[PDB]
Amino acid sequence: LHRNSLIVLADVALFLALYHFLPFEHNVVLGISMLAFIAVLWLTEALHVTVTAILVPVMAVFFGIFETQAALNNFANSIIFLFLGGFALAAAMHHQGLDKVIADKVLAMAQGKMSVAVFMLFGVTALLSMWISNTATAAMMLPLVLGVLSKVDADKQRSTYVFVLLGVAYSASIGGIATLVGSPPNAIAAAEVGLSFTDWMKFGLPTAMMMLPMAIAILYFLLKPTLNGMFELDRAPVNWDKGKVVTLGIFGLTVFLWIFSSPINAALGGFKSFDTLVALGAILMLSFARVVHWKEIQKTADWGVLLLFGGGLCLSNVLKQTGTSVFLANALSDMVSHMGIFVVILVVATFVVFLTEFASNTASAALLIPVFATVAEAFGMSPVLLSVLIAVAASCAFMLPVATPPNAIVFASGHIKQSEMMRVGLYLNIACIGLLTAIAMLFWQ
Amino acid sequence: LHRNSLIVLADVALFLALYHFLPFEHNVVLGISMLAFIAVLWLTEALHVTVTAILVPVMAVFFGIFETQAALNNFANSIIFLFLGGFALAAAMHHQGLDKVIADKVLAMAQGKMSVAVFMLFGVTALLSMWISNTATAAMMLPLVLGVLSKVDADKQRSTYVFVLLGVAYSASIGGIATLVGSPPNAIAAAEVGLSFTDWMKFGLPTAMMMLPMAIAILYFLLKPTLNGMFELDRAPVNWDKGKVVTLGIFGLTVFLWIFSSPINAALGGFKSFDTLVALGAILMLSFARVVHWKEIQKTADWGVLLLFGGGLCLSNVLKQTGTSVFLANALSDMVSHMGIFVVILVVATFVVFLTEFASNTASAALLIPVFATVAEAFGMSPVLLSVLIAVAASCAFMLPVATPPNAIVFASGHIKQSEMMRVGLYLNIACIGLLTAIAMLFWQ
Ligand code: NA
Ligand code: NA
Ligand code: NA
Ligand code: NA
Numbered sequence: 020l021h022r023n024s025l026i027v028l029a030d031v032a033l034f035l036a037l038y039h040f041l042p043f044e045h046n047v048v049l050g051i052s053m054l055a056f057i058a059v060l061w062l063t064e065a066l067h068v069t070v071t072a073i074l075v076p077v078m079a080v081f082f083g084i085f086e087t088q089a090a091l092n093n094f095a096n097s098i099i100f101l102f103l104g105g106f107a108l109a110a111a112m113h114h115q116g117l118d119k120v121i122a123d124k125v126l127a128m129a130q131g132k133m134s135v136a137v138f139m140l141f142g143v144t145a146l147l148s149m150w151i152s153n154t155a156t157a158a159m160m161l162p163l164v165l166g167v168l169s170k171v172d173a174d175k176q177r178s179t180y181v182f183v184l185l186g187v188a189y190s191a192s193i194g195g196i197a198t199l200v201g202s203p204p205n206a207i208a209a210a211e212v213g214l215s216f217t218d219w220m221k222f223g224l225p226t227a228m229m230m231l232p233m234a235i236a237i238l239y240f241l242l243k244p245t246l247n248g249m250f251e252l253d254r255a256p257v258n259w260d261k262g263k264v265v266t267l268g269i270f271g272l273t274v275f276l277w278i279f280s281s282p283i284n285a286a287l288g289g290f291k292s293f294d295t296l297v298a299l300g301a302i303l304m305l306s307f308a309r310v311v312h313w314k315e316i317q318k319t320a321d322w323g324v325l326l327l328f329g330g331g332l333c334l335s336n337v338l339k340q341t342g343t344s345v346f347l348a349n350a351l352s353d354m355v356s357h358m359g360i361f362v363v364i365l366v367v368a369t370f371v372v373f374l375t376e377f378a379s380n381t382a383s384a385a386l387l388i389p390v391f392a393t394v395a396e397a398f399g400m401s402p403v404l405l406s407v408l409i410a411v412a413a414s415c416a417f418m419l420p421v422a423t424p425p426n427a428i429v430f431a432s433g434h435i436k437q438s439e440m441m442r443v444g445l446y447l448n449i450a451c452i453g454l455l456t457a458i459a460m461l462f463w464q
Numbered sequence: 465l466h467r468n469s470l471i472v473l474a475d476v477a478l479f480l481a482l483y484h485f486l487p488f489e490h491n492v493v494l495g496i497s498m499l500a501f502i503a504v505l506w507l508t509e510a511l512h513v514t515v516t517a518i519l520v521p522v523m524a525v526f527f528g529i530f531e532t533q534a535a536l537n538n539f540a541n542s543i544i545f546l547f548l549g550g551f552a553l554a555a556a557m558h559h560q561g562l563d564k565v566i567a568d569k570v571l572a573m574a575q576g577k578m579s580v581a582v583f584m585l586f587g588v589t590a591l592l593s594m595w596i597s598n599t600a601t602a603a604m605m606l607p608l609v610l611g612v613l614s615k616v617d618a619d620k621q622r623s624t625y626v627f628v629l630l631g632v633a634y635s636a637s638i639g640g641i642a643t644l645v646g647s648p649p650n651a652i653a654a655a656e657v658g659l660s661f662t663d664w665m666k667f668g669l670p671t672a673m674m675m676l677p678m679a680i681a682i683l684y685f686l687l688k689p690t691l692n693g694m695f696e697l698d699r700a701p702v703n704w705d706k707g708k709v710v711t712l713g714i715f716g717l718t719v720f721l722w723i724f725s726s727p728i729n730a731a732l733g734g735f736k737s738f739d740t741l742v743a744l745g746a747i748l749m750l751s752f753a754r755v756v757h758w759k760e761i762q763k764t765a766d767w768g769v770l771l772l773f774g775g776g777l778c779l780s781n782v783l784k785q786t787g788t789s790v791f792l793a794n795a796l797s798d799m800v801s802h803m804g805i806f807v808v809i810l811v812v813a814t815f816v817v818f819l820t821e822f823a824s825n826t827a828s829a830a831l832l833i834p835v836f837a838t839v840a841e842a843f844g845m846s847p848v849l850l851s852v853l854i855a856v857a858a859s860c861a862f863m864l865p866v867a868t869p870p871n872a873i874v875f876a877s878g879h880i881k882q883s884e885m886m887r888v889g890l891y892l893n894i895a896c897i898g899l900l901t902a903i904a905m906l907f908w909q
């Protein structure tokens with residue numbers, strides 16, 4: 020009937036074939052077949068990643084791996100509520116116009132010169148993507164880009180549009196790498212291997228600061244924009260007012276608590292998920308101040324991402340319970356011994372960066388982090404390096420518009436060519452592979 | 465600054481006063497103060513009920529009652545996912561126009577006579593409210609009511625409008641009482657005292673069938689409509705097509721599995737939350753058939769209700785853990801001994817029915833079911849009768865437009881008077897009190 024339905028049926032056939040024709044233990048066979056089924060579903064997007072995540076507990080229970088409540092309890096992890104609080108913050112900013120105010124103030128700090136407005140556009144895009152999202156950030160920044168570029172004759176200077184546009188999209192995708200919020204893959208890794216907000220920040224903030232300038236330089240030295248004119252924005256200067264200040268103060272307090280959780284928590288009793296508690300407190304403070312309402316929060320939040328978090332966690336639990344992780348570790352011990360950690364991370368980064376171009380970053384991270392984590396635990400090899408590397412690589416999607424929402428959004432303008440986008444993404448992917456490998460070897464080891 | 469903020473501050477002061485000036489055990493004092501705080505917040509709607517629910521785990525953790533993960537695990541109960549699957553079903557029906565088709569076919573079964581079209585309008589409204597919702601049902605039925613009543617001269621026959629309108633609203637509110645889905649209070653009671661879909665159906669289906677005709681008769685004998693004309697609907701007759709049939713088949717299969725879970729589950733291994741598994745399977749089947757997509761499901765679903773379920777469950781757990789339930793039971797043992805179960809249920813039903821007029825049905829049920837349940841467990845007195853009675857009474861809101869969304873929606877037309885609505889709701893509330901008391905004493909004991 021449809022390609023998606025045929026893919027689902029073929030995946031079912033593959034599951035049955037592995038179930039009946041695998042000479043391993045029953046539990047290992049079940050886990051491997053389930054892993055292949057979920058992998059095909061997520062990568063091919065035959066069903067929505069959230070629907071597949073909902074399926075994971077169902078076929079875990081029906082095959083006698085977990086009880087229903089135990090399987091469903093993976094959907095209430097503290098990380099999910101942390102990222103819900105992140106959604107609440109972003110909804111408040113959008114409702115109050117804080118993001119627009121910040122962008123306008125930065126572009127005002129640019130007097131009239133487009134030579135610097137584009138670069139500060141990239142910087143503010145990354146800053147917003149730390150907190151709000153990768154998609155909404157690019158969506159709201161695009162009109163600003165077009166307004167700045169309204170006087171540059173977009174028939175003969177299309178290279179400048181490609182610059183200011185792909186830079187914004189990549190800046191959003193990279194700013195999502197700096198914070199636990201901003202990119203769902205970071206949440207998946209943190210949930211898998213117990214990473215706090217500041218623990219992830221110490222990992223992803225230098226990476227983002229070192230990759231964004233590299234991406235901009237690659238763009239500039241691949242395609243040559245002029246960047247010598249001036250821009251006179253027609254939009255009026257939006258000023259500060261009550262509610263924006265309160266939202267900014269709540270945001271700053273929440274960030275301060277997230278950063279200094281460890282001393283604060285040590286001074287309050289030692290709560291287990293203080294970051295999640297702070298996120299919920301942020302929700303409560305915003306509601307009390309009446310700067311955002313639950314209807315806006317609900318509309319802004321992507322609950323499918325949270326359900327996908329739960330599904331990935333359930334898959335990791337299934338792999339750990341069935342012995343599939345340790346079985347794969349025993350199988351791969353010889354290979355990993357022959358070829359060392361440097362090349363292990365090299366190939367992992369290459370695979371993830373070149374896979375997220377075709378597959379969703381969140382689904383790819385949810386699929387791979389459990390595997391390389393539970394397997395790594397069987398090697399010892401604390402599964403923080405691989406999980407964080409996989410999340411960052413998944414966030415690093417640059418070659419195709421379908422790869423990432425902001426890429427598609429910026430491609431919708433019509434001023435960008437498939438060939439140019441693919442080649443720029445190729446060079447950036449190679450550079451990101453090198454940078455991530457070096458970072459993991461040096462700073463993390 | 466604002467009444468809501470002042471209410472929150474006064475509630476904080478009350479919490480501190482109870483915390484410092486209660487001569488009970490520390491845990492009992494903490495539980496009682498927390499109960500009062502949450503009660504005031506929910507009843508006054510100073511903060512959104514969902515926000516208060518999110519607050520419940522936060523102030524449970526910060527006061528050393530539960531660990532963060534244990535407190536948050538109450539938000540992943542199987543009941544929540546059951547009602548999520550109900551949302552998925554409703555979204556599919558709305559997307560495919562199944563509800564509109566059903567209503568049109570029924571009104572076609574009425575040749576042209578409004579004497580019976582109104583009554584079948586009530587019946588179909590209740591049937592849809594069993595599954596879809598109380599609010600969306602009335603919202604989509606109202607245009608049909610106005611179309612039927614477009615030829616009745618709404619300046620001198622306003623009584624007929626009040627009839628056909630309040631009947632639709634009450635029919636929706638009552639149809640929500642027949643199934644576990646349809647009314648969040650039913651979900652709260654089922655989660656509290658482990659009730660299956662058919663277990664609740666055996667409770668709420670006779671109640672709805674016995675209350676809806678009573679409500680219609682009270683309406684007819686209080687206000688006198690003519691109901692002698694004819695209606696010629698301008699809208700074209702929408703016919704069946706591929707996708708509606710598939711959605712109807714999936715809905716029927718899901719209902720069949722929900723009804724016959726106990727034999728089926730006994731024949732498959734004895735899964736713990738087979739109803740929730742069936743709901744998730746319904747989501748999967750709908751997605752596979754491509755009759756609904758996650759974006760429509762997300763837009764349709766009210767995730768605040770699910771979070772409120774989690775918050776109420778956490779409150780019940782807090783009461784059980786702190787000994788507040790047993791302390792209240794010991795305090796009230798003398799009173800409940802002096803005055804028997806008949807009058808206990810009488811006063812409980814009176815309080816709930818006359819409270820849901822001012823307070824949201826879901827929040828009132830979430831507040832009261834934990835109290836009268838955990839307290840009842842301390843008496844023995846299996847807390848099914850009281851929980852189900854409270855849920856039904858909460859669903860029974862008829863006096864004020866602000867009481868229930870469908871009441872407000874039907875009041876938005878402008879053909880209904882506050883005085884008439886209040887008096888009709890008063891008589892219906894009295895009759896519902898009597899009916900619920902009799903049902904609980906006779907069928908349940
Ligand atoms: Na982001
Ligand atoms: Na992608
Ligand atoms: Na309903
Ligand atoms: Na109400």
